[PDB]
């Protein structure tokens, strides 16, 4: 088995994209009870990466860099290991669309994914 | 009295873009005690928003939606008041580029500038 398969190559972490022939868990993180593991990723996502259904349904409403560098609690330190930036905040979901509940349930399945995983 | 009819027109839901004729604080939040109202900011940014000197240097290393949604501790409750998205995560800057050193200073301007506002 492998645990650090991501170390075999070098990819842009900002533009990271998992593919149907690459381990999604290696690209981003593995499900677990900690934020550093990955609090989002259903058992269907891990099977195909970007070839997974509904993936673009999340990407459509996604926020641009403006709020990310606007109210997301921008704070970093310049350490010898390199800079470490953090982001904290909240946003209201797209309540005006007829697909609002579908988006809420879709997203919730990935969050509470580890709750139904073996 | 409400009268606000502008909201009937289609404005960017999560693609907030503040222009020279607009107020960055109205698009994000008003710099104050709450974390979510964007306590950080530069008084020269509020002048023009997207027309601010160095504006594209921030977005040049912004995480794509694929990175923004996964290892970011995404959690939201389905409340009557709406669904409230929250997040907590870290990012590594584009420390493999020569402009990184300039970006560090530029980004930090807004992080300390708020404390020097009148």
Curated annotation (Swiss-Prot), chains A, B:
Region (Dimerization): 12-115
Cystine residue pairs: none
Compartments where located: Virion; Host endoplasmic reticulum-Golgi intermediate compartment; Host Golgi apparatus; Host cytoplasm, Host perinuclear region
Record note on modification: Proteolytically cleaved by host CASP6. The cleavage leads to two fragments and facilitates viral replication by inhibiting host IFN signaling. The two fragments may interact with IRF3 inhibiting its nuclear translocation after activation and reduce the expression of IFNB and IFN-stimulated genes.
Bilayer-crossing regions: none
UniProt domain CoV N CTD: residue ranges: 1-118
Motif Nuclear localization signal boundaries: 10-18
Region Disordered, annotated ranges: 1-40
Family membership noted in the UniProt record: Belongs to the betacoronavirus nucleocapsid protein family.
Full protein name: Nucleoprotein
Designated gene of the protein: N
Whole-protein coverage range: 248 to 365 of 422
């Amino acid at each position: 088995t492998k645990k650090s398969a991501a170390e075999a190559s070098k990819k842009p972490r900002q533009k990271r994209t998992a593919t149907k022939q690459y381990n999604v868990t290696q690209a981003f993180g593995r499900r677990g009870p900690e934020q550093t593991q990955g609090n989002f990723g259903d058992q269907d996502l891990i099977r195909q990466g970007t070839d997974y259904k509904h993936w673009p349904q999340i990407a459509q409403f996604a926020p641009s860099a403006s709020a990310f560098f606007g109210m997301s609690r921008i704070g970093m330190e310049v350490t010898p290991s390199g800079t470490w930036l953090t982001y904290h905040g909240a946003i209201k979901l797209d309540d005006k669309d007829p697909q609002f509940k579908d988006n809420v349930i879709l997203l919730n399945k990935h969050i509470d994914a580890y709750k139904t995983f073996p």
